[PDB]
């Protein structure tokens, strides 16, 4: 399938134990895609002071369309030193590895895979 319905656990930034996917734009996008497929991917909602608590490069999920079965359509955009790799809509949050942190909510997304 070109798209996969996912429910992403929403994590508080101060709970997150692994604060990024790796060390290059290509690696973080790769790792994010693998974790999204394996159901081992969390979402941190971006507010004032969140991103400097996480590791660059960042992986964002961004709205790709204006929501089948409640799932918002999204795609991945990476960022390193203020340059983004991809072009998409509004940020729903930043992706991080999920290693058993207790979520505060779930974000239903339809991922262009």
b/e map of 82-112 (b: 16 or more CB within 10 Å)? eeeeeebeebbbbbbbbeebebeeebebbbe
Q: 48 Cβ partners below 8 Å, 6+ apart?
A: none
Provide the resolution (angstroms): 1.9
Helices (H) then strands (E): counts for the chain = 1, 7
End-to-end CA distance of the chain: 8
Count of CB atoms situated within 10 Å of the CB of 43? 24
Q: Which is it for the CA torsion 34, 38, 44, 46, positive or negative?
A: positive
Domain locations along the chain: 3-112
Extract the tokens encoding 101: 């942190």
Experimental method: X-ray
Other CB atoms within 10 Å distance of the CB of residue 65: 13
Question: What is the three-state SS of 30-74?
Answer: HHHHHHHHHCCEEEECCCCCCHHHCCCCEEEEEECCCCHHHCEEE
Q: Which residues pair with 76 in a beta bridge?
A: 61
15: its two tokens: 């709970």
In CATH, the number for domain 3-112 is 2.30.30
């Amino acid at each position: 399938k070109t798209h996969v319905q996912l429910s992403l656990p929403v994590l508080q930034v101060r709970d997150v134990l692994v604060r990024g996917f790796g060390d290059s734009v290509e690696e973080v996008l790769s790792e994010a895609r693998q974790h999204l497929k394996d159901g081992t991917c969390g979402l941190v909602e971006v507010e004032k002071g969140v991103l400097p608590q996480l590791e660059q490069p960042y992986v964002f999920i961004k709205r790709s369309d204006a929501a089948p079965h409640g799932h918002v359509m999204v795609e991945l955009v990476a960022e390193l030193e203020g340059i983004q790799y991809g072009r998409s809509g509004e940020t729903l949050g930043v992706l991080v590895p999920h290693v058993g942190e207790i979520p505060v909510a779930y974000r239903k997304v339809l991922l262009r895979k």
